[PDB]
Amino acid sequence: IKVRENEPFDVALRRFKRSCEKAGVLAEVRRREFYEKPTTERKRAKASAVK
Amino acid sequence: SLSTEATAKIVSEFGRDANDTGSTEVQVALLTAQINHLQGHFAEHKKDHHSRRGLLRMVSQRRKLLDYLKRKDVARYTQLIERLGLRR
Amino acid sequence: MRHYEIVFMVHPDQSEQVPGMIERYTAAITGAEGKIHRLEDWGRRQLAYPINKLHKAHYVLMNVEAPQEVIDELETTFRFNDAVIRSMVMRTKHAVTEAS
Amino acid sequence: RKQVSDGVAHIHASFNNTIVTITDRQGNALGWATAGGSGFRGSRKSTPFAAQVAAERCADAVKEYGIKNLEVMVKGPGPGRESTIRALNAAGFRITNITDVTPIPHNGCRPPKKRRV
Amino acid sequence: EIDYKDIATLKNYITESGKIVPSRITGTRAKYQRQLARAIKRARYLSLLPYTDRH
Amino acid sequence: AVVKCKPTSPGRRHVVKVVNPELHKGKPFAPLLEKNSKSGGRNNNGRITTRHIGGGHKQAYRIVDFKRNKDGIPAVVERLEYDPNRSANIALVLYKDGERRYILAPKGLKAGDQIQSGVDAAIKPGNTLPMRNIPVGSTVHNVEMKPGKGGQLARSAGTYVQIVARDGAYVTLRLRSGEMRKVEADCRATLGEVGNAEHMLRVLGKAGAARWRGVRPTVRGTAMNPVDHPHGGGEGRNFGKHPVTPWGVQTKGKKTRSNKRTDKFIVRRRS
RNA sequence: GCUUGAGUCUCGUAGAGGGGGGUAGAAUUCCAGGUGUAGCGGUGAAAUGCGUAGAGAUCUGGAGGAAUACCGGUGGCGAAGGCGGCCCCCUGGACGAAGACUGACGCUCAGGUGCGAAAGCGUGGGGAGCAAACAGGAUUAGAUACCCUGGUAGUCCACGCCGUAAACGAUGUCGACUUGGAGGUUGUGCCCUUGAGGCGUGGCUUCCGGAGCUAACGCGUUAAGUCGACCGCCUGGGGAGUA
RNA sequence: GUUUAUUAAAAACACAGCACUGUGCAAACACGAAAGUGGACGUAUACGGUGUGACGCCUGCCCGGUGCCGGAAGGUUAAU
């Protein structure tokens, strides 16, 4: 949302613009409510990746 | 559940010796006490199949122990039936 | 007979009647053979969200061992008292370092 | 001009269209502009430039009131969020707060199953 | 044993938005994560801890 | 929960027996009883005004405490009794002062347990409280349209009005049809919902079941000649005009509400 | 007779196990108001739709019904189906330490009985989202579809019925034996209470893997290995789980 | 079961059951020039009206017309 910062800024930016979890949870809340197999698919992929 | 003090009274009343919590009379008496409590539990709303499975398990294990008591010694079996009011 | 932890928040405008509140509730509890372990009046406290369009509420915690019947009628009194805006009755929450 | 001179810009950046509404702190709307009304329709509506034109249009819409500082309330997953914010500080209003007010439910109502293909 | 009254301790495990932190991040054991989750949900009920940042 | 009814006869085929063992078997309370002489399609003028009302079993009326006074005295519930006048059952209540009354029967009945309405009350349906004092999200019944009037809404079997909060002076009520009506917060309320929902499950089964209930036959207008009803005539089954009442107004659609004093209170109307 | 199988007792431990009742918070929709004014919604692009009768946006007050974001994890629990907010009441099971007790009371089980997702059925409620059927709009040669705007039964609750699923680990239940490694979860003993640090010992679980087995893929101490008890089932494919 | 007493007892009317619509209580609706009364000493699991007529399978399409429901952009609109 927003974290406490000093009112004068060197330049007007947001620190966590592209890292916000809001966009991802909005994309998952919109449609496609499977939620059963992707946990196992993610776990098998993660176990393959970790060596 | 069966209370500790009720369980101790059952083992002291139906036990041929003290600390005989394992005798067949004591096991059948404890099982009957839980049957009589669970009947009042299952009077209300009667949809608890999961607890009813444990209830039917107490019934079945009681039947096996009473059949064992029949084959081993019939005098004790008839006395236990007369004490707990079953198989009328 | 049974250990319980009771926390209730009171509307800020009704803050004058909370010592009488805890006195009558403790009296009912002690009449029902209960023992009060830690009667702590937390006092007024800002709330993280508004409930019933109020922002600051009185708080008091009781931590009583008592029978289930007196705790259920206590819960009824909490539901029917309009000063209590929310009340929670927990499980044993046994004897630990008091005043937490 | 207006005496309070403080406002909030609500950026409803949906996937198709971005609506920018500058209101006061009490919620009463002073002005609004949209990506469809900015002159871009169809595929260009979703693009970040359309939201920039929407922000500039609402900026000149509330230039009558003399808004000096505006907090920013951002809703939605659309491409127009950061573009609308940038176009507001380009329009020269001081941005005092940037809050992400997207309605994130709890497990909530059932989502639409549509667009499955 | 994690008490909901210790909102000072639970603030270390809530995020800025009010969410319960992941155990893979804070390194709590599974048992203390579950007790922490129950305590946060109780304190959220008592309004000691906020449900979300906005409200 | 339902005892089976064999089809020994047509007329016994369709009705299946749904009864309550908790209902009292015996005479009703005589102080709370008065006569109810049937007035079947009658008037002071003597004419039929409401049709299909007629011959049935004699019913004696029971005084039911729609307005719940005697507050401050705990009421112990007794065995529930059958009320032929209303759809739901009635419950005997004995207060600590000795006053015996009839109320609408709550869902829960406790035998051998004292019932209290003050400080020592439990979480039990049937407790009376004003609309200001109801809990958040609570369902109430026997609520009053005017403060001090008596019960007007949710007095039937299985009917309840749910309320979450209040505006401050007028509280909105979600009725069973779906209408939303603001009544004053001083109006009384009885917590929970009324029983005897299971009683409505069974079908009547025969013509004589309705004729016991007091319902005389309904003749369709198409059966009649042109003069008895606007529908009616011809050598075939259908008259073939727009659906109307015997006096001419449209049956289908055609909203007939004309009250304008109460339109401010009824902010929302059901479809 | 015996205690080594199976069981009982004491003390604890973890858990979306079940049933009942209460409450909280987001969010969606609707109703009434405040500001406000030409678009909104949607899509591959469009259109139906909604909107100058003032929508969409934003604020406030209220109503209602569902699922409980984060925690959340090839985590836990349950015989399976399955079970996720918090709280209370009622209850089933597992597991661990130290002993005590009973003394084969055990295993399986055709018939039989019970539980059995979702959809469906009956009666009565409820109905916010979603949505079979249905309507309109688009794509196409056509499109009784995929896409869009709607939308009823249903999904929700009480009681009763069905008795089916790719109900799967496509792997029946019980007991014994047979190299290891990395983990997750829950007990417990000791040292160094002294780094939720070292050393053990149980229960469930995930992955890889040796011998062995298999037609191969793979399984592999939770076997598809080596055995024993008992039950169910199969005997080419369509016809056919049909008459 | 009821029905044209006195040429028609039926396949007619009714009937349980089913749907739709109205109706938030001083309720709709009805008899009343009105007071009043019935509905109802009932409260949407209730009432009234319409059609169908136990039970099993179910109830297709078409809102162009008429009717009803909702909105009054715009026009045309009475007394005043």
UniProtKB/Swiss-Prot annotation, chain C:
Keywords, sorted A to Z: Acetylation, Ribonucleoprotein, Ribosomal protein, RNA-binding, rRNA-binding
Keyword match rRNA-binding: yes
A molecular function GO annotation: mRNA 5'-UTR binding
Post-translational modifications reported in the UniProt record: 5 different forms of the protein, varying only in the number of C-terminal glutamate residues, were isolated. The sequence shown is form bS6-6, which is the longest. The first two Glu are encoded by the rpsF gene, the other Glu are added post-translationally by the RimK enzyme.
Superkingdom assignment: Bacteria
Residue list for modification N6-acetyllysine: K93
Subunit structure: Part of the 30S ribosomal subunit. Interacts weakly with uL2 in one of the 3.5 A resolved structures.
Recorded family membership: Belongs to the bacterial ribosomal protein bS6 family.
Function statement: Binds together with bS18 to 16S ribosomal RNA.
Protein's name according to its UniProt entry: Small ribosomal subunit protein bS6
Organism: Escherichia coli (strain K12)
UniProtKB/Swiss-Prot annotation, chain D:
InterPro entries recorded: Ribosomal_uS11, Ribosomal_uS11_bac-type, Ribosomal_uS11_CS, Ribosomal_uS11_sf
Keywords assigned: Methylation, Ribonucleoprotein, Ribosomal protein, RNA-binding, rRNA-binding
GO annotation, biological process: cytoplasmic translation; translation
GO molecular function: small ribosomal subunit rRNA binding; structural constituent of ribosome
GO cellular component: cytoplasm; cytosol; cytosolic small ribosomal subunit
Domain of life: Bacteria
Miscellaneous information on this protein: Has been predicted to contact the N-terminal domain of IF-3 based on footprint studies; exactly how IF-3 interacts with the 30S subunit is controversial.
Role description: Located on the platform of the 30S subunit, it bridges several disparate RNA helices of the 16S rRNA. Forms part of the Shine-Dalgarno cleft in the 70S ribosome.
PANTHER family the UniProt entry points to: 40S RIBOSOMAL PROTEIN S14/30S RIBOSOMAL PROTEIN S11
NCBIfam families, per database record: PRK05309.1, uS11_bact
Subunit structure: Part of the 30S ribosomal subunit. Interacts with proteins uS7 and bS18. Cross-links to IF-3. In stalled ribosomes contacts ribosome rescue factor SmrB.
Family: Belongs to the universal ribosomal protein uS11 family.
Name of the protein described by the UniProt record: Small ribosomal subunit protein uS11
Annotated source species: Escherichia coli (strain K12)
